[PDB]
Amino acid sequence: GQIIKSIAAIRELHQMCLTSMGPCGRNKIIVNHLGKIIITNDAATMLRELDIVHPAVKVLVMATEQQKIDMGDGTNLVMILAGELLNVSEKLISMGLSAVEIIQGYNMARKFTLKELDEMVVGEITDKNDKNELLKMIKPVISSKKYGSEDILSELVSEAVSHVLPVAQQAGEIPYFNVDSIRVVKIMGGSLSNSTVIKGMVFNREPEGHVKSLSEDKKHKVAVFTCPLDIANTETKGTVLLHNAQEMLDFSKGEEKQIDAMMKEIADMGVECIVAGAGVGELALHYLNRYGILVLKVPSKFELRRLCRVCGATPLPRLGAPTPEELGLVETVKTMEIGGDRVTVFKQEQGEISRTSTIILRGATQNNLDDIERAIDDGVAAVKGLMKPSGGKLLPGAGATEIELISRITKYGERTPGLLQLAIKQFAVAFEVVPRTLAETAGLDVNEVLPNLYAAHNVTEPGAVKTDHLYKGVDIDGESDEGVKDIREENIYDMLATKKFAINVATEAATTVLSIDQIIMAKK
Amino acid sequence: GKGQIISNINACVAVQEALKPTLGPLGSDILIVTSNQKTTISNDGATILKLLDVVHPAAKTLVDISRAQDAEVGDGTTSVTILAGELMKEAKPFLEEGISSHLIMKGYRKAVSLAVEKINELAVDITSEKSSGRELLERCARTAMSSKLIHNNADFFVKMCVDAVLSLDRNDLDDKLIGIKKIPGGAMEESLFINGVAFKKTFSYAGFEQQPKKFNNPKILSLNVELELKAEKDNAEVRVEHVEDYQAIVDAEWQLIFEKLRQVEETGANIVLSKLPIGDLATQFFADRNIFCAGRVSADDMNRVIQAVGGSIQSTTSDIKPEHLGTCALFEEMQIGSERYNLFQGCPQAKTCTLLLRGGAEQVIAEVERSLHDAIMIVKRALQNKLIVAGGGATEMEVSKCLRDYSKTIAGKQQMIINAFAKALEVIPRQLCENAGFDAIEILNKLRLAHSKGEKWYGVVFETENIGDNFAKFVWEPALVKINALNSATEATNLILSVDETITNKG
Amino acid sequence: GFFYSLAASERKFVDAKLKKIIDLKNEVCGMDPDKGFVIINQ
């Protein structure tokens, strides 16, 4: 009976995910052995910080990572649904039904579900990229994570997406929106209402110079220099030493005249910003103050990649060769105080449209500060799902999808004769865990909300054409209500690309566990 | 599982139980022993809780909200931790009957919306009405000094406290700008208020330094490095090939320092300070020029001198520019405290001051030092924030009243939750009575009598046990405390009660 | 390294082979449409 105990080991981790999806979800504090606390609400990121022992759970963890890499959303739907398929299959194994026909039954039920997803599409996203149109897709992503911030964070995320996207329609050949185009930064102090949207990267460090900001001139030239600032010498060794005091006057004045000569040629070309990836000497900062050149140091090589796609600058392996062809252009750069400290940000005006934006977060809570940082990353991948593979189609969410599939699957159960009826019926019952989870965690009675969900999708209408309301989902209440309410009032929908991809992954996840009747391992 | 929720509630009770006696000026103090063995005793809950470093994850939330309580507000760090923990203790029996935690946590935020609108109705903006500039600071100073050993000597202490905040900007005020140094010995009523900075008199050795301490207009100059010859610690070894050359080896420091001896004479700076110990070489030439200098100056002491005359620190004495110098009105070093302590007076540009205290023991002054900080925080928040509410249990007892009537009009499970939320608010006035020795059973029962008569200003008298009004007792608290505490306690309460699992990795 | 206040030595071997390859596209398969030329260049 090892296959039964394997489900019980997953059942211990199943209840952990039942308290994740929904508005009742909470982040988990994990103390690493290196003395670092990583806090995230996302389940896929949580599995990376957790050490999995039993390899049977690793199959579900590897299936969860598939949801985060491609579609980036729906990781809670994959893990919870795959865990319920093992519970409904436990009764079939104990009943005497072999696991061979159980696996074959899921393959027939999966093909029947994918064909019905096209007829369940309610609305169609026009991909207008409007600020008001993006509020419908982003709202359910922020929902079931952090409560109360769905109204404020909806306008901040939707505004940054429209800045990095150009103007185009009905063209899917050339991709535009990437996953790195949206960066999230954090700073101590402020609130959510005072947060703004920046059209470019935000630098929270100090300029390290007496020049606070550049002028208002159009098309500022920005040059990225990987070579550090110093007098040109031999690449091999070349350490400056003083044998006697006579050579001190020649070596000291030589470094001052050589650096000043290189900065004069760069300032004449119209470059007001010099980006030095390496360290900057003491005498180099003295000449940059009189020429009015902004001092910027970016030691991280990851930040220079997204900078090349905005202004068009290119890193130069040498120093003192301001090639105008590889220089970048930015409309306006300003240094303002955001969050209590004066920092130099990066933005634009009209031309040189930036392909990367950054949203600044402000708040007095440290725990909820990193919560929004990890929550926006789940919303970034939602924009990627708007492409050709079923980006415009959408399905109603809030538990309305899993309940509606029950009536369609059971209708095809009696149509297919043979032993396949056992796996088809249990496949639809496994969808009942989603509506029960939201009602149990929210404190709603099972004897009340649950029977009203079945009566919402099942009614007696004297006619062939459907009518009344098929959009009624699972309601969290929170104030008062009688029965359930329409989901179309809050406009909470789920994309087809997210739901269709989550079904195929969850189906193959439970297939691997049921197919393994023996596990052989050894100590390390 | 469900057992982790109960285990997390009792884990916060052990931390809350220590913070209960620390509520109030007359309450008990926690004795904390750091790994460094340094012993610190104070009644301020901020520094206390920061020294616990509890491994339990939910206990870290109390530390996070304590930093925001001390930063944005600065007062009430003890009450915000007790109020946030009391809501979790009252919700323990509610979870054992099958009630989900989400309904209980949601009911807390329902009373928060009614509490924000209640504070605005209880906030009265008054400045010049029925008061003045001097009468406002004088009447509020004797309130924090009551029920203390300084109550008899408070007549001279209030006059020095009024002029303390007047020497600083009224728009921007900081409690750290007024320093307090413990001086053992002497009477407690002989202390005075000084605009400058004082030293610790670390030199117990005798036999030099004759000089009068009365100066007219000394010039202040900062020096970033130590300039000295005689050194008590290290020594120099000399081995060469000549007998007569043993002397000149240690003299390498002469010429460049010999020139710097007369540079101060040409500059005319009468005050020389450094963060490093200075030998007797600098104190040599300064005698005839009437130049005062003090060695082994702390790093925090020089930062207050730079902001005094507006000068700046320079590494050497050569390139010092004339704008780095500064001059005060008068320099007088008296024997107050049974020891000569240097001080500055008459600096118009000084952004900081120092309040000296005297007493027979250092522990007696430490009790007075923490008591004077409470009177400063009241004036600190009375300037920028114009909304003043009645504290000391007055507003606390009013919030619980109205919330009991609002629950009767709200059908559903929120009725018992809001009623329990207002019932948990009674821990604040209770603990204040237990710390002062007053009986919390009789007072809280008799206070609810007149509390329902329509007057919302009834407080708790901290001097003699009885019901009364804090308006006559001059007990005031800013409205920022009540707003920030209810928002931080509700967020911290709902964060811990929602924890279904405690995960800790070892390695 | 070559620091100028020199690059011909590095491009001497590159330009020798490059100029001979670009002449093959014009002489051979220049007029023929819908064709291309690919270089391996290990």
Swiss-Prot record, chain A:
One Pfam family matching this protein: Cpn60_TCP1
User: Which Gene Ontology cellular-component terms appear in the entry?
Assistant: chaperonin-containing T-complex; cytoplasm
Q: What is its main location?
A: cytoplasm
Query: Which SUPFAM superfamilies does the UniProt record give?
Result: GroEL apical domain-like, GroEL equatorial domain-like, GroEL-intermediate domain like
Name the InterPro entries for this protein: Chap_CCT_theta, Chaperone_TCP-1, Chaperonin_TCP-1_CS, Cpn60/GroEL/TCP-1, GroEL-like_apical_dom_sf, GROEL-like_equatorial_sf, TCP-1-like_intermed_sf
* Keywords of this entry: ATP-binding, Chaperone, Cytoplasm, Isopeptide bond, Nucleotide-binding, Phosphoprotein, Ubl conjugation
- MF terms (GO), sorted A to Z: ATP binding; ATP hydrolysis activity; ATP-dependent protein folding chaperone; unfolded protein binding
Q: Name one GO biological process term.
A: protein folding
Disulfide feature: none
Query: Does Secreted appear among the keywords?
Result: no
Asked whether the UniProt record includes Nucleus among its keywords, one would answer no
The subcellular localization recorded is: Cytoplasm
Entry-annotated residues carrying Phosphoserine: 480
Family membership, please give it. Answer: Belongs to the TCP-1 chaperonin family.
Q: NCBIfam families in the record, alphabetically?
A: chap_CCT_theta (TIGR02346)
**Partners and quaternary state?**
Heterooligomeric complex of about 850 to 900 kDa that forms two stacked rings, 12 to 16 nm in diameter.
**In UniProt terms, what function does this protein have?**
Molecular chaperone; assists the folding of proteins upon ATP hydrolysis. Known to play a role, in vitro, in the folding of actin and tubulin. In yeast may play a role in mitotic spindle formation.
What this protein is called in its record is T-complex protein 1 subunit theta
Task: Print the organism lineage.
Answer: Eukaryota, Fungi, Dikarya, Ascomycota, Saccharomycotina
Gene it is expressed from: CCT8
Curated annotation (Swiss-Prot), chain B:
Its keywords, alphabetically, are: ATP-binding, Chaperone, Cytoplasm, Nucleotide-binding
Known Gene3D superfamilies for this protein? GroEL, GroEL-like equatorial domain, TCP-1-like chaperonin intermediate domain
Protein localization: Cytoplasm
Q: Which GO terms describe its cellular component?
A: chaperonin-containing T-complex; cytoplasm
Describe the function of this protein.
Molecular chaperone; assists the folding of proteins upon ATP hydrolysis. Known to play a role, in vitro, in the folding of actin and tubulin. In yeast may play a role in mitotic spindle formation.
Question: Which PANTHER family is this protein grouped with?
Answer: CHAPERONIN
Protein name stated in the entry: T-complex protein 1 subunit eta
Query: What is the protein's species of origin?
Result: Saccharomyces cerevisiae (strain ATCC 204508 / S288c)
Curated annotation (Swiss-Prot), chain C:
Q: Where in the cell is it found?
A: Cytoplasm
Q: What role is this protein assigned?
A: Molecular chaperone; assists the folding of proteins upon ATP hydrolysis. Known to play a role, in vitro, in the folding of actin and tubulin. In yeast may play a role in mitotic spindle formation.
Q: Which family would the database say this protein is a member of?
A: Belongs to the TCP-1 chaperonin family.
Question: How the protein assembles, per its UniProt entry?
Answer: Heterooligomeric complex of about 850 to 900 kDa that forms two stacked rings, 12 to 16 nm in diameter.
Q: What is this protein called?
A: T-complex protein 1 subunit zeta
Q: Which organism is it from?
A: Saccharomyces cerevisiae (strain ATCC 204508 / S288c)
Q: Provide the gene name from the record.
A: CCT6
